[PDB]
């Protein structure tokens, strides 16, 4: 296949910056703003410090989609350098407008992008990313690219706990939430958290997770993703009790400080890929 295939996503992904380098996957930042001074999300990886940031906060920081221009500048970008496809994938429309955002500035710059939507973002988009862009660097063609993406989207399921509604309610996402100081786990599904249980103690996450691999866990599973806002013990309980029905590899990774902020402390992901 001729021509060079690029991918790029935006910086909800959940990824060690390895395998970003590795595959040369281009990252868009989102923003947050923290008591009134804008920070790049490119800036706020290294672990525990955005968590620090947000403890301290006086507010509650705000985050925001990349720029149109921003967009624009680095389609242009790769055109320059001689990129004859790029595949753009991108964290729900439910949850943000980023995805327009980077279709609009794939107009601006005339760009050849074709715009994705992941359906869910973090380590289970980073799923899709990883693939696509093993995929463009071995020389796939963008149709086997597209088919391949859209066979590891069909097969993936995001579950989400949060120990608060708090984040949800000031950052606006409750708003998908399907139903104040409470354990809840929701499936993100569709255009929504569909909320599957609720309960008191983190005992909620453990009880629905054992249900949840007792259920499904005879399908064999691909890969399996936890992430985590706050401190990793409560990920690194889940890890263990996953680790029971299922004997591969298990990345476990801090979220980002744009999950962070509409999540609260005390969150985490499971993300589950099956063959
Ligand atoms: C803890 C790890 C959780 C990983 C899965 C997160 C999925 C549901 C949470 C809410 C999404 C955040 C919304 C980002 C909006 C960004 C913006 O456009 O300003
Ligand atoms: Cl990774
Ligand atoms: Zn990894
Ligand atoms: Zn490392
Ligand atoms: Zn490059
Ligand atoms: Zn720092
Ligand atoms: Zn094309
Ligand atoms: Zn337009
Ligand atoms: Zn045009
Ligand atoms: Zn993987
Ligand atoms: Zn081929
Ligand atoms: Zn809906
Ligand atoms: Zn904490």
Redesign the pocket.
């Given at each position: 296949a001729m021509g060079t295939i690029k991918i790029v996503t935006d910086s909800?992904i959940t990824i060690e910056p390895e395998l970003i380098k590795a595959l040369d996957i281009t990252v868009v930042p989102?923003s947050v703003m923290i008591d009134s001074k804008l920070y790049s999300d490119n800036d706020l990886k290294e672990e525990g410090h955005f968590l620090s940031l947000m403890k301290a906060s006086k507010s509650l920081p705000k985050?925001?989609?990349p720029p149109v221009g921003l967009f624009a500048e680095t389609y242009e970008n790769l055109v320059k350098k001689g990129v004859t496809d790029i595949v753009a994938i991108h964290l729900s429309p439910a949850?943000?407008?980023?995805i327009e955002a980077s279709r609009q500035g794939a107009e601006i710059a005339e760009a050849p992008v074709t715009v994705l939507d992941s359906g869910f973002?973090?380590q289970a988009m980073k799923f899709q990313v990883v693939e696509a862009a093993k995929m463009a660097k071995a020389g796939a063609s963008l149709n086997e690219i597209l088919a391949a993406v859209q066979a590891i989207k069909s097969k993936t399921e995001?579950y989400?706990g949060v120990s608060t509604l708090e984040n949800l309610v000031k950052?606006g996402?409750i708003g998908r939430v399907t139903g104040l100081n409470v354990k809840v786990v929701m499936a993100?599904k569709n255009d929504e958290?569909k909320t599957l249980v609720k309960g008191r103690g983190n005992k909620t996450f453990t009880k629905w997770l054992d249900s949840y691999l007792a259920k499904n866990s005879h399908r064999p599973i691909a890969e399996i993703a936890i992430?985590?806002?706050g401190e990793a013990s409560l990920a690194l309980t889940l890890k263990e009790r996953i680790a029971a029905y299922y004997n591969h590899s298990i990345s476990v990774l801090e979220?980002g400080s744009?999950?962070q902020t509409?999540?609260g402390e005390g969150?985490?992901?499971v993300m589950v890929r099956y063959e």
């Open positions: 909800s989102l985050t925001s989609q949850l943000s407008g980023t973002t973090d995001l989400i950052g996402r993100l958290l992430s985590y806002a979220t744009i999950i509409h999540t969150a985490f992901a």
